[PDB]
User: Which sequence fits this backbone?
């Protein structure tokens, strides 16, 4: 959609973005991504992952109106899942959570884009 690329985010749009974010935070499989990765759970994580991201950081940026275009919001969300699949092996519970939660996000994102005009 060109509106995703070109149209600045409005206060109305941010009500939808908060709804998408809350739906992910409530998802059963979102537990590994609610808060930043604890370095004591993964000692070399922050030397390996250049741009870490988590849902609590995105909650702060949504509240602060940090995002100006929908592309930037999708980019932050995608970092969460791409970081996880790059650091972890395919049989990790974190990796499997990233697979289900990203599919859930795409569903919710399609819903946000569809209703963005009404
Ligand atoms: C490499 N690595 N390590 C952790 C993590 N999340 C995460 C979040 C909370 C808790 C745990 C893990 C384990 C036990 N305490 C609660 C991710 Cl997503 C990751 O990729
Ligand atoms: Ca990526």
Assistant:
């Amino acid at each position: 959609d060109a509106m995703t690329v070109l149209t600045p985010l409005t206060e109305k749009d941010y009500e939808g973005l908060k709804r998408v974010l809350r739906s992910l935070q409530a998802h059963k499989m979102a537990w590994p991504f609610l808060e930043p990765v604890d370095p004591n759970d993964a000692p070399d994580y922050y030397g390996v992952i250049k741009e870490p991201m988590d849902l609590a950081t995105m909650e702060e940026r949504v509240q602060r109106r940090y995002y100006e275009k929908l592309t930037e919001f999708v980019a932050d969300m995608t970092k969460i899942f791409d970081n996880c699949r790059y650091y972890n092996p395919s049989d990790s519970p974190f990796y499997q959570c990233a697979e289900v939660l990203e599919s859930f996000f795409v569903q919710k994102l399609k819903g946000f884009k569809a209703s963005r005009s009404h």
Observations:
- Residues 32-33, 37, 41-42, 45, 84, 87-88, 94 surround 7XE (ligand 1) (CB under 6 Å).
- The chain has one domain: 2-115.
